Amino acid sequence: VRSLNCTLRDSQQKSLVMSGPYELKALHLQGQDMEQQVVFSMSFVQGEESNDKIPVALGLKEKNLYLSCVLKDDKPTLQLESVDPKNYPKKKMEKRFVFNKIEINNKLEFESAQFPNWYISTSQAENMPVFLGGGQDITDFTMQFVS
Ligand SMILES: O=C(NCCO)Nc1ccc(Br)cn1
């Protein structure tokens, strides 16, 4: 499987950092604090594809942790999920790990492949969790490539 290391920033230009072991949060960051941002390994996985819709998995660089979409208290919910480090990443990722990376107006949205029309989202407020949203909440991102 092919993977690229990258960071993400929301359309309000908030960066993403760890919020405990299994959550991410978004906040405005600049300067030395930039080292705190999460670096993703974006893997290009199997799934239905178009020019503007590309299936990816979002793992944390050098960690056996992936973003995943599951029902929690009966609601679609973004979680960080651990995996066996000997088996990942792989080309045929389970559907809960797959996001459709969609380019619209020079920004990216990440739609859950498991839950159509649910998107990786951030709040306008500082220091709040990254979540799966189904308006005020931000669903557009840019990507920064990392060496
Ligand atoms: O401009 C970007 N990065 C800033 C320099 O690090 N990224 C970018 C641009 C278009 C789309 Br679509 C997604 N990401």
Identify the residue whose C-alpha is closest to ligand 1 atom 10: 106
21 CA to centre of ligand 1 in angstroms? 28
Atom of ligand 1 nearest to the CA of 145: 6
β-pair type (40-44, 75-82): unpaired
Angstrom distance (rounded) from CA 4 to CA 21? 23
Q: Name the residue range of residue 137's domain.
A: 1-147
β-pair type (15-18, 24-27): antiparallel
β-pair type (65-72, 24-27): unpaired
From 8, 105, 143, give the residue whose CB has the most ligand 1 atoms within 8 Å, as the site to mutate: 143
Cis status of the peptide bond prior to 89, with omega within 30 of 0: yes
Angstrom distance (rounded) from CA 9 to CA 28? 9
Domain total in the chain? 1
The resolution, in angstroms to one decimal, equals 1.5
The domain that holds 55 is classified in CATH as 2.80.10.50
Q: Which two tokens stand for residue 130?
A: 């990254």
9 CA to centre of ligand 1 in angstroms? 9
Q: Give the 3-state DSSP-derived string for the chain, with helices as H, strands as E and coil as C.
A: CCEEEEEEEECCCCEEEECCCCCEEEECCCHHHHHHECCEEEEECCCCCCCCEEEEEEEECCCCEEEEEEEECCEEEEEEEECCCCCCCCCCCCHHHEEEEEEECCEEEEEECCCCCCEEEECCCCCEECEEECCCCECCEEEEECC
Give Cβ neighbours of residue 102 (< 8 Å, ≥ 6 apart): 52, 53, 54, 108, 109, 110, 111
- Tell me how long the chain is: 147
Cβ–ligand 1 contact at 108 (below 6 Å): yes
84 CA to centre of ligand 1 in angstroms? 32
Give Cβ neighbours of residue 51 (< 8 Å, ≥ 6 apart): none
Structure determined by: X-ray
State the virtual CA torsion across 124, 127, 133, 135 in degrees, nearest 10: -10
